[PDB]
Structure 1
């Protein structure tokens, strides 16, 4: 159902909350009364509507079939290229992933997308990442790899990855420090 503001805009008038509730209850009674199309269109006048796009497969000079995508996390931006056929090799900035990511947590984060759809060792990945720290770069590469791999898994697997959070871009970024307080939220020591 449209909100009270939408109803007021439609009727170019001002209505109270109780009037809106009365009208909504009347509309619900109309819907539950096995109303025909002549009334279903009337209902749809007051109805308001509430999937991830996938990049297409491309081809390179070498003849391999691949997809390319990108992602970001905090202040790090990464671009990933995933080939349809590979051997699990991932090279970040021209460096092998186990050398560019000595931390095991980052390597686990990189493994997470392919492991979720059960495709470890079935692809080859080349990533270019810039900015942020080790974990931000790992997260950006993870998001880019998942977005690119969406071009090779089935739609059901795409929906499963979306439900697993592999495709949502993490909006959590550093909050700015404000004047009069130590940090983003840390106030100064309240004297007495």
Structure 2
């Protein structure tokens, strides 16, 4: 299959030139980034599964790795563990155990994880079993358990990976208006067919205006006004701030809730960095994932079914 890789990489480069010259770019600085744009513009497949869309790529990313020739032309196998049927695995095992033994004679939460099973399977170009993986990782714990030499640490670093974690509600810098020279913050909430936008002015009379009318008149339902009151009563700012509001879509409770989200979002410019995590744990800034569920055909209410008959 190696002849295929030689050939394919050759034709890949020849077709690479051929691509650049028609697409009219310098063949030198042509990247994969450019390859994509190129094909995407030439063979525009709307298709949802992205692997079935046209590809020109370096055969190495296209084709799977191969297991090399395992024996000389005499029939005689190169690796001494060959007859285990997994040499790739047990070589790691022999080495790991050797490392351990040497450590024993010598000795007298960063976001780092061990490989997945799939990653060790990629590293050794070898199918694996869960048990096997587990065995190995177990062994690496034994390794970490002792005094850690230099090459010891490098060794375990091979099987190390690192993962990101990010939590902060993204903080908008405020915006000072030119007209009054005054600072405002403009939030956008979206709940359930209803979007709202709320501009909050930092020096208020307590005035709250909705779609050009007063909030009492636009929410005659008391419950709604309570929902509105929530963020401000939380941050004790009730009189301090002056808000303008534009909301559309859906029915009243949905609207009051959208304004809740938008407001609580526009209120984190004028609050302290600490009160933010509170509003999170109060659940003010998190959208409501809850929405109507489509009726299903042959049923009644997406859940409700036509009355079922035993006879």
Tell me if both proteins adopt one fold, taking TM over 0.5 as the criterion.
yes
Matched, 1:74 2:187: no
Matched, 1:42 2:157: yes
Matched residue, 2:174: 57
Aligned residues: 192
1:16 is matched with which residue: 117, 129, 141? Answer: 129
1:125-181 CA distances to partner (integer Å, 9 max, x unpaired)?
A: 111000011111111100000111011111110111011100111111111111110
What root-mean-square deviation, in Å, do the aligned CA atoms of Structure 1 and Structure 2 show?
A: 2.3
> How far did residue 8 of structure 1 move?
3.4
- TM-aligned CA distance change 1:189 to 1:161, over 3 Å: same
Deviates more, 1:55-64 or 1:19-28: 19-28
> How far did residue 12 of structure 1 move?
4.3
Matched residue, 1:138: 256
What's the secondary structure of 2:200's corresponding residue? Answer: strand
Matched, 1:118 2:236: yes
Matched, 1:188 2:306: yes
1:20-74 CA distances to partner (integer Å, 9 max, x unpaired)?
A: 3223333444445464787287178333334111222112223321011101010
Q: Map 1:80-95 to 2 at 5 A.
A: 80-95=198-213
Q: With structure 1 as the length reference, what TM-score do the two structures score?
A: 0.88
CA distance in 2, matches of 1:57, 1:72: 21
Q: With structure 2 as the length reference, what TM-score do the two structures score?
A: 0.56
Structure 2, gaps ≥5 residues long: 1-112
What's the secondary structure of 2:188's corresponding residue? Answer: strand
CA distance in 1, matches of 2:244, 2:169: 23
Matched residue, 2:61: none
CA distance in 2, matches of 1:114, 1:28: 51
- TM-aligned CA distance change 1:164 to 1:188, over 3 Å: same
- TM-aligned CA distance change 1:114 to 1:11, over 3 Å: farther
CA distance in 1, matches of 2:139, 2:289: 41
Deviates more, 1:112-121 or 1:9-18: 9-18
* Equivalent pair of 1:27/1:43 in contact (CA under 8 Å): no
- TM-aligned CA distance change 1:97 to 1:9, over 3 Å: farther
What's the secondary structure of 2:189's corresponding residue? Answer: strand
Matched, 1:173 2:291: yes
